[PDB]
Paper text:
The rapid spread of B.1.1.7 has increased concern about those natural mutations in the S protein, including 69–70 deletion, 144 deletion, N501Y, A570D, D614G, P681H, T716I, S982A, and D1118H. To determine the structural basis for the enhanced infectivity mediated by the S protein of the dominant [name]-[name]-2 B.1.1.7 variant, we used cryo-electron microscopy (cryo-EM) single-particle analysis (SPA) to solve the structures of B1.1.7 S in the 1-RBD-up state and the B1.1.7 S-hACE2 complex with resolutions of 3.7 and 4.1 Å, respectively, according to the gold standard Fourier shell correlation (FSC) coefficient of 0.143. To improve protein stability for cryo-EM data processing, proline substitutions at K986 and V987 and a “GSAS” substitution at the furin cleavage site (S1/S2 site, R682 to R685) were introduced into the purified S protein, according to a previous report.
Residue numbers in the entry:
A (entry chain B): 614 to 621, 641 to 676, 689 to 712
B (entry chain C): 713 to 827, 854 to 1147
C (entry chain B): 961 to 1147
D (entry chain A): 862 to 911
E (entry chain A): 1110 to 1147
The structure:
Amino acid sequence: GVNCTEVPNVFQTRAGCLIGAEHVNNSYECDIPIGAGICASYQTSQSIIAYTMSLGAENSVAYSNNSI
Amino acid sequence: AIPINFTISVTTEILPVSMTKTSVDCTMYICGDSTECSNLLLQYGSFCTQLNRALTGIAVEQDKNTQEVFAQVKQIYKTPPIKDFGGFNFSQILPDPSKPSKRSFIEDLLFNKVTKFNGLTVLPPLLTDEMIAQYTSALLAGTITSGWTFGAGAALQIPFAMQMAYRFNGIGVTQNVLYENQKLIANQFNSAIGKIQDSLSSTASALGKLQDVVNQNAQALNTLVKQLSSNFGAISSVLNDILARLDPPEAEVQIDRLITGRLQSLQTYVTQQLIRAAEIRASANLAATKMSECVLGQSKRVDFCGKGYHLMSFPQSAPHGVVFLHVTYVPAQEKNFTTAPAICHDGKAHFPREGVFVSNGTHWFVTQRNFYEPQIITTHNTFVSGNCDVVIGIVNNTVYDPLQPELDS
Amino acid sequence: TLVKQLSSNFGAISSVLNDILARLDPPEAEVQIDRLITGRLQSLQTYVTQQLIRAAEIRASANLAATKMSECVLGQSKRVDFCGKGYHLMSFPQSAPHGVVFLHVTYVPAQEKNFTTAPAICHDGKAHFPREGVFVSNGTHWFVTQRNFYEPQIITTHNTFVSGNCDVVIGIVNNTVYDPLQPELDS
Amino acid sequence: PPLLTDEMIAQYTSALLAGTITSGWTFGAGAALQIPFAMQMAYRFNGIGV
Amino acid sequence: YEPQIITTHNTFVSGNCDVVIGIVNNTVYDPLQPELDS
Ligand SMILES: *[C@@H]1O[C@H](CO)[C@@H](O[C@@H]2O[C@H](CO)[C@@H](O)[C@H](O)[C@H]2NC(C)=O)[C@H](O)[C@H]1NC(C)=O
Ligand SMILES: *[C@@H]1O[C@H](CO)[C@@H](O[C@@H]2O[C@H](CO)[C@@H](O)[C@H](O)[C@H]2NC(C)=O)[C@H](O)[C@H]1NC(C)=O
Ligand SMILES: *[C@@H]1O[C@H](CO)[C@@H](O[C@@H]2O[C@H](CO)[C@@H](O)[C@H](O)[C@H]2NC(C)=O)[C@H](O)[C@H]1NC(C)=O
Ligand SMILES: *[C@@H]1O[C@H](CO)[C@@H](O[C@@H]2O[C@H](CO)[C@@H](O)[C@H](O)[C@H]2NC(C)=O)[C@H](O)[C@H]1NC(C)=O
Ligand SMILES: *[C@@H]1O[C@H](CO)[C@@H](O[C@@H]2O[C@H](CO)[C@@H](O)[C@H](O)[C@H]2NC(C)=O)[C@H](O)[C@H]1NC(C)=O
Ligand SMILES: *[C@@H]1O[C@H](CO)[C@@H](O[C@@H]2O[C@H](CO)[C@@H](O)[C@H](O)[C@H]2NC(C)=O)[C@H](O)[C@H]1NC(C)=O
Ligand SMILES: *[C@@H]1O[C@H](CO)[C@@H](O[C@@H]2O[C@H](CO)[C@@H](O)[C@H](O)[C@H]2NC(C)=O)[C@H](O)[C@H]1NC(C)=O
Ligand SMILES: *[C@@H]1O[C@H](CO)[C@@H](O[C@@H]2O[C@H](CO)[C@@H](O)[C@H](O)[C@H]2NC(C)=O)[C@H](O)[C@H]1NC(C)=O
Ligand SMILES: *[C@@H]1O[C@H](CO)[C@@H](O[C@@H]2O[C@H](CO)[C@@H](O)[C@H](O)[C@H]2NC(C)=O)[C@H](O)[C@H]1NC(C)=O
Ligand SMILES: *[C@@H]1O[C@H](CO)[C@@H](O)[C@H](O)[C@H]1NC(C)=O
Ligand SMILES: *[C@@H]1O[C@H](CO)[C@@H](O)[C@H](O)[C@H]1NC(C)=O
Ligand SMILES: *[C@@H]1O[C@H](CO)[C@@H](O)[C@H](O)[C@H]1NC(C)=O
Ligand SMILES: *[C@@H]1O[C@H](CO)[C@@H](O)[C@H](O)[C@H]1NC(C)=O
């Protein structure tokens, strides 16, 4: 939880600052473990994108006291 | 002996699942930016490289544990916003959005009950305890809405009352008993969950089992750090003074015993820290098994999953561990009866098919096993084989025929 | 790694014992070879201990494999999600170098069509319950079916039982129940 | 010296045996509910498909 | 081993005869019929 302004692109994590990834705003069932929720991948012009992980698809099931 | 009456009972259960992922480095612990020491160590064997190896191995092992135990789902189900679950009222264990993170009340209690210079860092876990809570909320909504069908695949909704009827049917208590006693069982469930609440909030620290992992690890780290203060036979403990006092050709000597002592301390530390995790992951595998067998289904294996006959289980998180709630069926008020193996009628014995033959003193009756529900003796629930002589011990009675009087119409 | 440790001095004069033999035979040979022996002895010991721990690991996995063999193979398990994923039908073993490879054959239902259910069907004041499986409706004709595969049948006394009142139970429906004995009694 | 004393362990094994002789499995879920042995063995046999 | 006669109280009815593999005839007994004497 320390500041990478002390280092001799740029991001910040609860584990440190990784230098190079374009930080994005969508979430994928993600490959590489970085830390505390941030996790990277090589995708698309193309580069490394480090981004918030997402635990999975959302399927809220319909429920009713007389269905089956 | 047979029971008249029964209680639903709710038990808590605790489990360690992982521990904080420390990582302590070679060159800093031993001597920390004293290139004289570094040049003295570089020609020792490849010890501390492979120490670092082992320790980072433990560290990745922890998140392997957490993902095996919690990611036993594949999606994110969430509960429908009309809480018409037929009397049963889980509102204490489902989430509440206006709690700051998506914890829940019992989760938040569990959280509020339980509480640098030397190259030794603490990595952060790879799942955020928020995400852990989101999994457990998914598991709750799953095993509640969809029945237990989602053990196999695509969840298949089914109303809760039907589901608990099926749960009963899986321990040999025919369906009706639930429907006839729904309100009572619901009130029992509710008061039990509330007792769990008020207990845990006013309990002793009886989450102690999670306490021990953390206390052990932290005291070991205290020993490792403190060890730096011992002279180990040299001129002085502080390496920045040994370097800055003696000449080099003299220095090598006094640094030698210091290096060997600190190395041996570091090796003892890592050797114990290996066994710590080598038993934690045994507990973690046990937790994974309990999660899947209990939550995503039902366990006919007596007393694997909280005692009494078993009905349902709900999971909850905890800091570096998991906490199950077990919902079981137990008989309380029993009563006397007198029985016999078989009923000789008209020169043929009869045996019952599911339940026992039971008397109140004058007549005889057939009942299911675990909850008294008397019935008459009919050809339907019994079956015959041979005379009534061989079967050792027997009592006479009359078997009524459900066909003759209707036939005699 | 163990073998590589023979190429290190551990703070002596060399990384071979023969050279120190050549150079200096009297006591200083002791005060040097001391270090070779100490270091090499550690290296051996610290190989043995972590080998011992790894052995513990493999024994744990071996005992899991034993239980899995003698539950999934020689029988049919009902521990859920033990032998695979989904309801369990069968398994076959195969043998890979230093390990075993299980093929689990499981049965999983995929297509899902929904209907409407009900706990019981009151009649003449008495309430029938199913013997197994739920009641179900395509809208008008209540059919009773096993919980795990849609094949409907006509509701009958022979696949139900009785509880002679329909008021304490919550959420009943009404419908005629068929009776096979009456038409065969019409003769 | 060990905490439980082998005489005490003998008492537990005697008890845990008397229970299973007299009341079947039931005393693992609650209070013992008596059945006569022969009938209990018959119900075990029913439990394994015979 | 415990032979019994084949009746309605130990067999159920599913569908047609000509789709299952290796079926056989034999006479199912219907113990209602002997009592169906009236
Ligand atoms: C389910 O149980 C909860 C547990 O408290 C009940 O919550 C109360 O709801 C009333 C609303 O009538 C509030 O005024 C109270 O503050 C709530 N808490 C308590 C301790 O009373 C809830 O009513 C129950 N039923 C439902 C449908 O949620
Ligand atoms: C079976 O047990 C339950 C609880 O264990 C009993 O429920 C309560 O019984 C008392 C005793 O008369 C009543 O005053 C309460 O009103 C009951 N609870 C509720 C929610 O109604 C139940 O009465 C017992 N029944 C028998 C036949 O023993
Ligand atoms: C035991 O069960 C029998 C069966 O119900 C009870 O006998 C009933 O007694 C009442 C009057 O006491 C009669 O009106 C009923 O017709 C009887 N039933 C039958 C089927 O004949 C009996 O009361 C119960 N208790 C005892 C101590 O025998
Ligand atoms: C249990 O044992 C008793 C023995 O007292 C049996 O009582 C029967 O009647 C008298 C008892 O004074 C004896 O002479 C009989 O030989 C006993 N019969 C048998 C078969 O033992 C009682 O019947 C026994 N219980 C059962 C179910 O057989
Ligand atoms: C099964 O579930 C689906 C999902 O809720 C229901 O689908 C809708 O039902 C309404 C009412 O008939 C239709 O008007 C919609 O067109 C359906 N949606 C789709 C996407 O087809 C369906 O009704 C449920 N089954 C029953 C019998 O109600
Ligand atoms: C199952 O849930 C539905 C959803 O509301 C309940 O529907 C109501 O049922 C009552 C009586 O059957 C009607 O008077 C209401 O008009 C229904 N609601 C609406 C919005 O039309 C239904 O009652 C629930 N089942 C049971 C057994 O209570
Ligand atoms: C289901 O069918 C039965 C068969 O006629 C009927 O039951 C009536 O239910 C009402 C509801 O209170 C009673 O007032 C009547 O006395 C019952 N019998 C008759 C002959 O009407 C009714 O058509 C249906 N019941 C319900 C609850 O829908
Ligand atoms: C069971 O196996 C036997 C052995 O192969 C089968 O016997 C053959 O049956 C066909 C019927 O189409 C005949 O044409 C052959 O001549 C039979 N074999 C011999 C050697 O005679 C038998 O068919 C199998 N069971 C069933 C139901 O087909
Ligand atoms: C089982 O019995 C049926 C009827 O009893 C047999 O059906 C025969 O089918 C043939 C067609 O090849 C007809 O010519 C006959 O008239 C039918 N009846 C009889 C009594 O033969 C059927 O063949 C029998 N199955 C076997 C394997 O023998
Ligand atoms: C370090 O980072 C935190 C989080 O962004 C920030 O609040 C703090 O001001 C930073 N410190 C410095 C010295 O910039
Ligand atoms: C961050 O999210 C916002 C949401 O509107 C989006 O517009 C923006 O492009 C995202 N940032 C990047 C770098 O994509
Ligand atoms: C039981 O009933 C049969 C039927 O007639 C009778 O012969 C026999 O004596 C009865 N048993 C006793 C002990 O009376
Ligand atoms: C329900 O199924 C029966 C088949 O037995 C059919 O004849 C009837 O039309 C069906 N009803 C609806 C509403 O689909």
